Amino acid sequence: IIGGNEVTPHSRPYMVLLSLDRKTICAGALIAKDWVLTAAHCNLNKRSQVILGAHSITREEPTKQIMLVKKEFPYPCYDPATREGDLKLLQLTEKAKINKYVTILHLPKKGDDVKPGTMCQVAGWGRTHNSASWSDTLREVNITIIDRKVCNDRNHYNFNPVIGMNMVCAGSLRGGRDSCNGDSGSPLLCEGVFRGVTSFGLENKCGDPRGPGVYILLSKKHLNWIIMTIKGAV
Amino acid sequence: IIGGNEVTPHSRPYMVLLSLDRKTICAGALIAKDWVLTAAHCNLNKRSQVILGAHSITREEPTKQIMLVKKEFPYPCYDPATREGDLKLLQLTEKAKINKYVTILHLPKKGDDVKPGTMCQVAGWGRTHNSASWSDTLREVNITIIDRKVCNDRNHYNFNPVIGMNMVCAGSLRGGRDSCNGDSGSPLLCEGVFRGVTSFGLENKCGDPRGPGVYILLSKKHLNWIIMTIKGAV
Fold this sequence. Notes:
homodimer; about 230 residues; mainly beta; Thrombin, subunit H; seven-stranded antiparallel beta sheet; 2 helices; 14 strands; hydrolase (chains A, B); cytolysis (chains A, B); glycoprotein (chains A, B)
């Protein structure tokens, strides 16, 4: 997260810290006791870890719950080329113990787009401005969705890549306010409601005006798949 | 087809006439002896007929090879909301008789994106100008590829629907030359190469400058699905 601030320890109990390996981490959201929603491009291995109730990566916290992935459910229509439908569902081998520091983030009751100018927040352990490595403590920044037509104009992504109707832009026309490397998969909340999944921006150009954050919109389509997968398995 | 002309009987032996029902028809392309490529939104029913070597819908022709669909293969990631990935492979119960009036249209070698200004054409038995009734004879129109960026400008689709990198726009800036209802599924030919499949325009406004024809681009992802589907047997 760039241009944000360190949140109050455990003030965002739905945040999931995904420790992929020693060189990369991602974020996610607990949408069910045994289900985590993250980005499809976030690669997991035997060295990865799904941590709940955390604030600091290193610090040993009693609230943390390190869970295991029973099975990965990437969005079948994911297109790694443009990062379309960049969503992946993590089924946990055991139900997370829901409490005050570990809670569920409910899905959007409807999959409607987000109007430009709406205010949204984004949390994560990704890198910041004055740093190259990830942030040890959770951070969040306030941003605003940019009209997707602007998201595609010459001052921005300029059809490279194209931002479709299942994606939202958000950040700042001036920049400085944005999610970075490590925040991928972080749940995008607008006006207090889960609306998207952090997907991508300009490589190494986090916070740069031309690369406002891009999030997968929890549209009707995506929503129907998510719900179908939670109940489809056992 | 609007703004075109009646082709020479059987001068486009690769064209497939899809008689869906009594109220609707579509077009397609014979990409293999027993394989027809058409649009996913073209609905077929028990009494639908895949007519080959046709020119007239009504008139009786000895070059016609009335076929039947053995199984439909719609694009697994086709989105009916945005007509995204609007494609469908039809497997015929029996292979066709390749002759002078019945040919196989070759698949693109590379899933390139046609450059703006390129000359292309489209044939179909769809409706024409001032003549709301579906043409009885096959027709083709010479069209040009319209820059995707322009295809999304305010003076056009204005990012709604949004035309992605997997879709191309062709027709005319001044309008008048465009594919129409009934021409769905028809193959887009550019420089003599199969480059796309007819998908949509503007409801009852084909030929309108504001809404140039949108064609699914035969990109790599799409071509692979095609080549991967045929080989599959079970």
